[PDB]
Design a protein around this ligand. Structure first.
Ligand SMILES: C[C@H](F)Cn1ccc2nc(Nc3cnn(C4CCN(C)CC4)c3)nc(NC3(C)CC3)c2c1=O
Length: 278
């Protein structure tokens, strides 16, 4: 199995959960918790300080359940656990969301790096779908990046092993229409990945209230109606994007973003398509 640690041991590393910006321990908030920079001698760690009492505890448990079962180079690594805390290997380059937006002065990702991240993220979703798991929250904030900008699929608090649910959970800007209806399907993860791919091409967030269109997925409709093209939306913060591979990534995202779930490709086909692109 895997390593288990006491609450008294982890209370120390965090410098007693000092919520402070590292620009002058709080490195950012994440969904139902908050991440703090922790240590274990010579290996830096990330501590998920979790903040419905019964369901927050079961989201902490499912994470440990899926992480113990699923180990891959394109998935984050859980080191320890336990008021609740979750301990991970610190990802030096944070989220794809923050790197796409150049948060805290980080330089823009090149097209070449964007392609490897997309292939990386597709391989991690493939491993999860092979092991009969549905992520349920595929988004760029959940794609973490290590020391070599290797994509790592994160957050499994909502993960599940064509079934319906009463309480609908996820990120609305990334959700498939059937997921918004209550359905649970691996095909909904493909749709969400289609939105991530568009964020990679455009460098635009999936939703921006002070923008028209508010939703990034709406640009698929603007392009098909020949109102605009993909070149109008390519991230301008790159010098190495070529139309052939950019139009090839868009074709994969467009296919993923089909309204009819059975008309969408499987993760193995998406994975196959991104490999043909390079
Ligand atoms: C469930 C998931 F796997 C848990 N997990 C695991 C690891 C992890 N590692 C980081 N590393 C990190 C954050 N910022 N930077 C910066 C530092 C400043 N520099 C300018 C750019 C890179 C590096 N952040 C995390 N979360 C976010 C994104 C803060 C919210 C997580 C995280 O949430």
């Amino acid at each position: 199995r895997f390593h288990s640690f006491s609450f008294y041991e982890l209370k120390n590393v965090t410098n007693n959960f000092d919520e402070r910006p590292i620009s002058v321990n709080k490195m950012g908030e994440g969904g139902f918790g908050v991440v703090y920079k922790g240590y274990v001698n010579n290996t830096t760690v990330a501590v998920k300080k979790l903040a419905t009492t019964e369901e927050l505890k079961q989201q902490f448990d499912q994470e440990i359940k899926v992480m113990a079962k699923c180990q891959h180079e394109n998935l984050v690594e859980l080191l320890g656990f336990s008021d609740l805390c979750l301990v991970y290997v610190y990802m030096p380059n944070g989220s794809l969301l923050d790197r796409l937006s150049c948060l805290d002065g980080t330089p823009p990702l090149s097209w070449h790096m964007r392609c490897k991240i997309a292939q990386g993220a597709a391989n991690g979703i493939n491993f999860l779908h092979e092991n009969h798991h549905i992520h349920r929250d595929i988004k760029s904030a959940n794609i973490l990046l290590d020391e070599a900008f290797t994509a790592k699929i994160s957050d499994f608090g909502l993960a599940r092993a064509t079934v319906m649910t009463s309480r609908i959970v996820g990120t609305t800007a990334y959700m498939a229409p059937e997921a918004l209806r209550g359905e649970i399907t691996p095909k909904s993860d493909i749709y969400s990945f289609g939105v991530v791919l568009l964020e990679i091409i455009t460098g635009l967030p999936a939703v921006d209230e002070h923008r028209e269109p508010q939703l990034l997925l709406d640009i698929k409709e603007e392009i098909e109606d020949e109102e605009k093209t993909i070149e109008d939306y390519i991230d301008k913060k790159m010098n190495d994007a070529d139309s052939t591979s950019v139009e090839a990534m868009y074709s994969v995202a467009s296919q993923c973003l089909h309204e009819k779930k059975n008309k969408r490709p499987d993760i193995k086909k998406v994975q196959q398509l991104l490999q043909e692109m390079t």
